[PDB]
Symmetry: C5
């Protein structure tokens, strides 16, 4: 006789209808147990507020018509079937934004009691509101909703193949070598209802991820740390020295190029910039302000009581002539010294507030590190 | 016997024609009620005047042939059917620019009285005349037309499923953390006639959106304002100093490279310009003016009638070897006649350019305030 | 009885063949009248030399088989048909470069005489040579040919639905806020021949467009003139002063920076360069020439007459008290060897000032000329 | 009589199925011998950890039904049959991230005893654990596992066409002009089981490559060594030098410049950054701390003995009116003659600067040479 | 009676197969004469070593079964037929990398004897071994191989339609308005056997091009010469002046901004870079080295090997009362450099040394430019 596999396929698929739900009593639904396994976090576009991932998607459902007695067909129980030749649920993501380029799995398994298995990988693109204020240490709670766009809960009830804990503790395949770590995958069933009698089933996966800030930190923050420190020792230089002026303008140019390119390295979002950029701009502000005051004082030494009060509140005759010129600096010196001292004690104030900004920067970095270490 | 579902599918889709419009009396049209919900705003390319969004698109219509008696089929009333096995209208947006990647919904529901439902999402790409003049604070009355590319109004009359108000305030599904914010969507129906015998139906969901200016603002205004700051202290540098000149040239090339990057950073408009760049370039103008004037007076101190008729008209408009080395000690301070001939001009011009720079940034601030009031009022 | 619409679809589409040209006498061609409207101008890549456009391509032709008596089928004259169930011509563009993502229109009308109408949008990616020589005010005569890639004129002759005047005057559908305006669309029929004995039909559409240079003008031409004027005033500075040299080298830096954005903002064709950059680099050339001559004279300052002959040929067309006074008068007198070259340093400075001003003048002149030529179209 | 080629095709493709695994006894699997060749290494995304390649994939298996007697069919022993007219295995790669654009090869050769040959190219995009620590001279062991997504080892037992030595030796087709090289293609077989009843056969291909570091070498190391020599002559300057500090800030400018150039040029996975930037930042750290030391000296030579005692311990561990106008002159000397002996400790401190900086640049050069040697050791 | 154009389709396409090679004796191959015309060159990825083109590709072969007597069909000798209803060869390119987006020509012509013509526009992408050493004036001879991925010469022997001279000379359709100029397209037939009994026929088309550098000249080469020349006159200066130092630093900033454009406009390739960037590296190196030398001489100006210094200039020459005392102070004030005169000497001649090597690099750059121009103009 003929092979049992061919005979079984002919016996089943003949008089089978793709479009009809594989049920006898229409009043019942047909449930779908699924499973989600995270492979990789491909891209995180903070500006577009989207995510790009790759998963292994498993699916199960029962078809009342794909049933047989194994005894006739040579005790065969399992069978491979083309997925294009059977009914399939239109399960799909609500957070979906753009068609992920993924292959097609033509085949599916079919047991001798209607059960079906549809394993397939899945690239996908989804929307996710990303909080980038703690930019290097930012941690996300993106979702992956699962439901049918059309069919209601009376036709399709989403379920799970496994326990939720077994899903959260599943990291056998995930690659930890990207910029992004994976902490868990927390599922949560829910029912969803546009209006009464329009109830819809739903399943959700609270995907959680964490950023690895080491490259970003060492290549962005520490440059700024060294920059703030060299600004500090520039404040340490003697007041109103052109050496200090060259110092400050060199640092100004450095800050210029630094902020320019790190703006390209720093993806900001609708919130604005993150806190690191805030510290950057304010330390730049203090640098340019101290530069301005230095050049103000060196302008003044070139030959008021109001702000004086304000700031102290804020807490041989020819040779006699050429020796009057020996004394010319002292003659200008009383005014020169008063102006220089007021300018210098302003430099100390700028130094103080720069130190405050640096300390707050360090403290914020420590706090962000700890919250990152919530792991 | 067999299941009622299979029997019914056999009865409904055998001897059915997907290509034929599902009507008995051809003189009738077939109406299509729709609905639109904005899921999110993805991208707004101010350069090419194009928009990209994601919506949920419901549409309803009737088929005279998809009708059955529920009692014959186990009192069943509704059923899913594949899209590919039934007639579908060629509804299409008028202002498409390129097809967007949207997944396919194979199935559609069908009731026992010809009714049909087809729910699906749509990544769409549409042209929109954008006004970049209030670049960070703009509001944009883009549109989403809906009609058939081919079918007349006598075959297809577009309709609205819901009320216009419920469609306006349907902010249930949206994402707010994105760059943009959606103020409302206002539907409107009209007819369209390229010529007689081409009367076509049309909807118009006037999608409205609002920007969020912060990451542009703090990232870009404050470096510009710092350029303004270092320019005013460059005005305050000593007039005689040629370190002032190098300083101000550094600022001039700074304004230049800033114009460069904001050309390579922000999407420069097609028509008009944002006034922010206008304030920036007039700041550059004041910079180069002060530079020219300080080097001018520098070479001077190294035409008093010019000076004095000019200030006159301005006033009208306001309406032994020991004695020798002592002579040398004076010679240290002896060119001050020709120095003071132009040093008052130096000081007064420095203060004047300073003042008008401050006035320019005042107008900058006022423009920012007015745009803020508008952006809030919307 | 049944609806006449379904009866008619069964009458026509049965025993119909998509592949066969819908003709009874093969010797006659199948005319295809078309019409084109430019919805918008999306992008034009001056680096890669392509053009992106969206059009509402219309199309009309005849099928001998799609013919019926309306009276039998309930006085029905018109109906829709799926486009994928009938013969269609292989109309296609010869300037085509890349398959354009565009939606499909699955349906078409058919009248009772055999007529057909296929309305559909169409995105294009076509090659167009571009003159970037007048980069700010450039104007293009891009083309859009239409023809069968395979079929001859003896099978498919192209035609127009409307008159060419109505076409060129057609600007009803357009997005006017983009950079590129539209002036007209000039068609011109033509017959084509890869080789004799195989004659091909064509129907061109000389798309013409024009650029809005306003933001280009602001971002480019005003800072150019600003650097020009800055150098102009810098030239006034005294020759020996090294701050003049610092001025001129830093401004040369600005010149190179502007040239950098020029090379960048213009990723233009390597076949031809605009003249804005030309005027700018000769400006830079005069600046560096001034700089070099300045360093030369500055070195000559402190401590020869062949030089003077040559520029003339050009012009043809108590000991210690005494020591104190000597110190004073020698710090005064070191200018003597300086004057001997400052005499000609001033001359060089002013000649270069003159020629620099001439170059800037010609720059403004050319800019106004191109403004005029722009407005002329 | 009809053709042979024509009436073999009709004999075979009639009553043949595409969903049925081509077997008589279902209990046996159907084996699939393969063979892989690397045509080119197109792109290596160091940031996203992605590999883009292009291969010449071969594929062999057997069909119990596609068999015949050549003697009937004019001694025909091979035939071109379309790929979409017979069963095909769902052999794919686990490491896919996207789908690669590769054209469909419709035809496949078939012998008169079930054997099938399906050659085809496969552009493919996969992930790989990249190692950037040796950023100039990095080498990678990327993998391409081949396995059926669904079918188990009881249905599909993957195997290999040739011997693995033949595969590793095979470099007949490769573009050596790319940024990368090809060292071998090392196969390996494995059974894969997430759990019992999921025994999945597979075959690996450890694609190994190597970078050509010349461009990166000249564009990173040479300016690094330049600035290093500049630091050398930097500390060579004795103390109390305004030249020294002006120089050192010039070096600070250059180091900030090339730090940002470093950030620009190299992309980098954030799991770990390379030693090159480490040497950069630490030598810049040395620059700034010695700058601070110079500043402290400059204020000490201008105008703290516990420092001296602790430093001596540290060093043990290391082991008349004319007269008045002439005084108006001589203060020019007394302004110099004012000196402090803190400078002794200050510039005995600079002895440690020489040591640490030469040590740092030595470590840099030594590790660089080591990376070169390891690159050549491949 | 019905139209012959319909009877013909129903007479041929019935009982026809799309998979069966249209042959009556399997032993013979299906010869496929082809032809290639270059419409345009689109982009050249020197970075990734990839080419992309657009081609008007044609095919000519025979079908044993698509035959008829025109007399029975109203003397009809030709016919259009859907391409997706007949056998087709699996012609494909070996240099192919990724699927290019080309439209589909659903129709093909057919003659009464068996000939089949299938014209189509190919939009193509291929890998090529690109040489950027003469980056402004380079010429890359890329290949476009054509062969069947599966069949052998025993089933498909590829041939050519026109003569190779007609192929080379045919540069009419190519637009000469882009960046890259075309020179010729040389065909070459070949047989291939990586292993035995697999005689995969093929055919190559050596596409050969040339870059138009006139933009790049004014963009990069001319201003680089200006940078070189300002640095020349900088090295015309004495070591004493710190103005020299500030000058070198401003030129250093100029090359600093050159770095960003170099990465952006010169297409940096990891395997190799042009001689141009090498000369620029040399000029930058000599600039910073002269900066180091003049600051060394600035040190030497500052009051604290001199006989060593004179050994080295020999190496060169081989290679080549209050008032009384304050008046004495005036003398030594104008002569306080008394020893640093000796070091200003060597600083000056060292400025001349660095000046020699710098102008040498500059003129070598110029000469190499001229040589590249001559080679370019030669071919």
């Amino acid at each position: 006789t003929q092979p049992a596999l061919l005979r079984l396929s002919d016996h089943l698929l003949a008089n089978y209808k793709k479009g009809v739900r594989p049920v006898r009593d229409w009043r019942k639904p047909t449930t779908v147990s699924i499973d989600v396994i995270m492979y990789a976090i491909l891209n995180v576009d903070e500006k577009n507020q989207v995510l790009t991932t790759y998963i292994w998607y498993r699916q199960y459902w029962t078809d009342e018509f794909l049933q047989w007695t194994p005894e006739d067909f040579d005790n065969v129980t399992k069978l491979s079937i083309p997925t294009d030749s059977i009914w399939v649920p239109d399960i799909l993501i609500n957070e979906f934004v753009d068609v992920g380029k993924s292959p097609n799995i033509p085949y599916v398994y079919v047991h001798h009691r209607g059960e079906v298995q549809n394993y397939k990988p899945l690239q996908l693109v989804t929307a996710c509101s990303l909080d980038i204020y703690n930019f290097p240490f930012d941690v996300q709670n993106c979702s992956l909703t699962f439901t049918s766009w059309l069919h209601t809960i009376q036709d399709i009830n989403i379920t799970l193949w496994r326990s939720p804990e077994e899903v959260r503790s599943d990291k056998s395949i995930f690659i930890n070598q990207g910029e992004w770590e994976l902490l868990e995958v927390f599922p949560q069933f829910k029912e969803f209802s546009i209006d009464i009698s329009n109830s819809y089933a739903e399943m959700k996966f609270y995907v959680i991820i964490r950023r690895r800030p080491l490259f970003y930190a060492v290549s962005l923050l520490l440059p700024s740390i060294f920059l703030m420190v060299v600004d500090i020792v520039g404040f340490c230089l003697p007041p109103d020295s052109g050496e200090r002026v060259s110092f400050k303008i060199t640092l100004l140019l450095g800050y210029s190029v630094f902020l320019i390119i790190v703006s390209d390295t720093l993806p900001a979002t609708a919130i604005g910039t993150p806190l690191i950029g805030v510290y950057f701009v304010v330390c730049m502000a203090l640098l340019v302000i101290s530069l301005a005051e230095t050049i103000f004082i060196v302008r003044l030494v070139h030959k008021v009581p109001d702000w004086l009060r304000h700031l102290v509140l804020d807490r041989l005759q020819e040779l006699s002539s050429i020796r009057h010129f020996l004394e010319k600096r002292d003659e200008m010196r009383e005014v020169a010294r008063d102006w220089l001292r007021v300018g210098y004690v302003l430099d100390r104030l700028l130094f103080r507030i720069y130190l405050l900004a640096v300390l707050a920067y360090s403290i914020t970095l420590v706090t962000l590190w700890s919250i990152w270490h919530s792991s």
